[PDB]
């Protein structure tokens with residue numbers, strides 16, 4: 347009985363609408379500075395040619411072409427290739443380093459298809475464990491005072507969760523990495539959400555520390571990822587609630603509009 | 610709590626397995642990428658010397674000054690067309706909510722960054738429902754098709770399940786990897802390997818960004834990008850399943866080899 351109707355259609359449109367709203371807000375937020383920068387870089391070239399007429403346009407385009415090539419590629423060392431494998435199985439894939447060989451690519455393909463499932467188990471376990479650790483913290487002392495206390499518990503969850511997994515590591519990145527108060531939190535979310543643009547990596551900037559920072563960051567990821575995995579899932583539940591509430595509020599409006607128009 | 614010990618024992622064992630898996634991976638990439646790295650790290654210095662010595666003009670020490678300005682301008686990919694125009698920003702939000710995050714173009718304003726955080730915090734869960742719905746919808750289209758082809762093989766229960774999964778992977782690779790990779794090769798002027806490498810890096814949601822179905826503004830036929838969206842939307846759902854299956858196989862191989870080691874340890878070849 348094919349009553350199994352396509353509910354996806356509604357969601358699809360909401361997503362399409364969500365992208366349109368996004369695209370516009372990003373255009374309005376980034377296209378301005380793109381222009382200012384697009385002009386300041388033109389002012390920098392002309393400054394270069396004149397301040398150093400010793401290099402001509404024809405010798406400048408060669409320079410700029412060779413550096414875009416050098417762009418294509420200290421790396422792949424003892425530990426760099428180790429984090430590369432980290433961004434593969436985690437799917438964060440910052441991309442600051444990526445294979446350039448046909449073999450590295452193929453191996454990355456296989457290394458990922460087998461790596462991501464495996465890491466999922468680890469992350470799954472780490473989650474359940476961290477989910478029980480809070481199972482030793484939340485319900486026990488939160489019962490000191492049906493769905494009314496649940497809201498304080500969840501607030502306690504996200505609040506500390508942001509402190510341990512977002513606040514503190516952001517503060518540490520701010521000092522150690524030399525990032526903005528915002529840039530740090532930006533990195534945390536872009537990373538722990540697995541987005542991983544790669545615009546900010548917690549290990550670029552050739553080298554400053556040793557032996558007490560990258561291990562913490564790594565295990566930060568191992569646990570932070572599990573934390574957002576839970577967080578994102580709640581936001582998914584929240585949205586599911588809001589959807590049905592808005593579904594019933596719509597039938598609410600219609601009932602009155604109809605019950606009114608009948609007059 | 611009697612189970613809390615055993616679950617912790619499995620997590621710890623899996624973590625250690627993960628550590629070893631990273632170690633074997635890093636070693637294989639290092640051994641296969643660092644050579645070309647050093648080959649290029651020396652030829653780029655050869656070019657600098659050819660540049661510095663041919664005209665070590667007063668700015669010879671101010672050279673790295675320039676290279677810092679263009680590398681910084683590189684992150685914005687300056688062309689010494691807008692990358693935040695109507696459509697490009699639309700593709701950006703797509704790279705955000707799908708967590709592909711190619712990163713080639715990312716926000717630079719505090720406002721852009723703060724909205725991007727909120728946008729992902731809300732967008733990721735949202736897109737998850739769509740991808741689920743797409744998964745289910747595509748799953749029932751294979752259920753309608755798997756019934757026709759499993760009854761032609763029922764001419765003669767626990768063994769036909771393998772024939773079904775094979776045809777899945779087969780049509781899966783065909784529609785979602787083979788065809789699109791081909792189109793990427795022709796249009797994007799990519800190699801046979803780069804296209805598949807792209808498809809895998811993209812649909813596994815890793816998204817290095819070294820390759821992008823529109824990263825270059827080349828000429829882009831008027832329906833190219835829409836078709837690619839649909840590819841992404843159904844390609845991601847496909848790999849979600851394939852990845853989910855590979856996990857099962859791992860767990861099968863995992864717990865089957867676990868007993869094989871106890872098997873081994875017990876006998877030890879009669880000793």
Ligand SMILES: CS(=O)(=O)Nc1ccc(C(=O)NCc2ccc(Cl)cc2Cl)cc1
Nearest residue numbers: 421425426429432433548549550560563
């Ligand atoms: C710039 S470099 O690539 O050439 N050098 C390296 C730089 C950093 C790291 C590293 O371990 N960073 C911590 C980390 C670990 C795993 C994951 Cl997924 C994400 C992060 Cl941020 C390794 C090599």
Ligand SMILES: CS(=O)(=O)Nc1ccc(C(=O)NCc2ccc(Cl)cc2Cl)cc1
Nearest residue numbers: 692697700703704822823824825834837
């Ligand atoms: C380099 S550019 O940014 O300045 N120009 C653009 C380049 C490409 C695209 C585009 O549509 N690519 C297909 C696509 C679509 C959605 C998703 Cl999630 C991923 C992908 Cl690969 C748009 C603008």
Ligand SMILES: CCCCCCCCCCCC
Nearest residue numbers: 452455456459460801802805
């Ligand atoms: C040009 C053909 C490249 C083939 C690489 C695909 C390897 C897939 C192996 C899957 C093992 C899990």
Ligand SMILES: CCCCCCCCCCCC
Nearest residue numbers: 360585588589590592593731
């Ligand atoms: C900040 C805006 C939060 C609301 C996001 C849109 C959720 C609407 C769901 C409607 C489901 C039909």
Ligand SMILES: CCCCCCCCCCCC
Nearest residue numbers: 356360363364367592593596
């Ligand atoms: C920001 C995304 C949309 C904001 C809320 C509007 C959604 C209304 C959907 C109506 C479905 C009944």
Ligand SMILES: CCCCCCCCCCCC
Nearest residue numbers: 622626629630633866867870
């Ligand atoms: C194949 C990559 C390395 C994993 C193979 C062996 C892992 C540990 C052996 C089993 C331990 C019980």
Ligand SMILES: CCCCCC
Nearest residue numbers: 459782786787805851
């Ligand atoms: C063409 C090879 C595809 C492999 C997907 C499992």
Ligand SMILES: [K+]
Nearest residue numbers: 436437540814
């Ligand atoms: K994931």
Ligand SMILES: [K+]
Nearest residue numbers: 437540708814
């Ligand atoms: K991801």
Ligand SMILES: [K+]
Nearest residue numbers: 540541709815
């Ligand atoms: K990613």
Ligand SMILES: [K+]
Nearest residue numbers: 439542710816
């Ligand atoms: K990424």
Ligand SMILES: [K+]
Nearest residue numbers: 441543711712
């Ligand atoms: K990236």
